[PDB]
Design a protein around this ligand. Structure first.
Ligand code: ANP
Length: 274
């Protein structure tokens, strides 16, 4: 075939590992996103079930692909001499959570509850498929505005999920746990939960709680916005200094603050004016 099975549009984002463009599949007009990653900027390399040297991002995306809309679907991929090109599904209209929060400010709790629940469902899907995202954050979450459905993207910092200790990290620092900062060691699940705590704080406060290593290590959370005691409790639990003190995914979803979540479509009708 050859890459030109697609019509390239505007640049949607860069600055992380790749440059992502809006595109359209010529065959059926399907909207897609075209992500380019330079071979020299790829942190971890992996190999495909059939024996081929490809970026870990392709390995992980293949492992999570399925009918579940919570994670972006990899449609196809290509290798060039100096890069890899990934063809991803693209919702329309769409907006990433960083832009959404930047534009709208702190989210009402009902909206944050729906968004956060969906992220949880998506991360649980990843882990059940043997994949650890390692870069959960606003920029890496897409909002399908008409459907009220959130989608996780950017597996460029990810890894295969394991139960032993990780001594490597290339995700976002200010989303990284204190055990990483101090000892360069963490376990996947508890680190994911720390990042979820940063994410939830960001949603209900409009910004992240910590900027410097010192603040991460201290782990003291201050609320600048009016946030319910149940939400505050959940956030502070996710941000426990000792990893074993953090809640499992099940405890998060069983937390009182998470009860009575809106359906995605309900969410869009009320908060995204469908
Ligand atoms: N499938 C998609 N559909 C629509 N927009 C996308 C899609 N993939 C990525 N984007 C946008 O492009 C940006 C960069 O995509 P991403 O896969 O995150 O690459 P990255 O530049 O390497 N860093 P990051 O934002 O930390 O993942 C995002 O923040 C999204 O705004």
């Amino acid at each position: 075939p050859l890459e030109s099975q697609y019509q390239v549009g505007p640049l949607l984002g860069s600055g992380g590992f790749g440059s992502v463009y809006s595109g359209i599949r010529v065959s059926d007009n399907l909207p897609v996103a075209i992500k380019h990653v330079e071979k020299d900027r790829i942190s971890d390399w992996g190999e495909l079930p059939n024996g081929t040297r490809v970026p870990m991002e392709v390995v992980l995306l293949k492992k999570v692909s399925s009918g579940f809309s919570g994670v972006i679907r990899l449609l196809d991929w290509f290798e060039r001499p100096d890069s890899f090109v990934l063809i991803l599904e693209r919702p329309e209209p769409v907006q990433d959570l960083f832009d959404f929060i930047t534009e709208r400010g702190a989210l009402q709790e009902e909206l944050a509850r729906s968004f956060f629940w969906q992220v949880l469902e998506a991360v649980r899907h990843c882990h059940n498929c043997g994949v650890l995202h390692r870069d959960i954050k606003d920029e890496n979450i897409l909002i399908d505005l008409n459907r009220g459905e959130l989608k996780l993207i950017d597996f460029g910092s990810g890894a295969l999920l394991k139960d032993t200790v990780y001594t490597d990290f290339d995700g976002t620092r200010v989303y990284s746990p204190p055990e990483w900062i101090r000892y360069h060691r963490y376990h996947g699940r508890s680190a994911a939960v720390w990042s979820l705590g940063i994410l939830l704080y960001d949603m209900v406060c409009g910004d992240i709680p910590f900027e410097h290593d010192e603040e991460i290590i201290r782990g003291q959370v201050f609320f600048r916005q009016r946030v319910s005691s149940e939400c505050q409790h959940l956030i502070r639990w996710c941000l426990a200094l000792r990893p074993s003190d953090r809640p499992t995914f099940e405890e998060i979803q069983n937390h009182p603050w998470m009860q009575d979540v809106l359906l995605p479509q309900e969410t869009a009708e009320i908060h995204l004016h469908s």
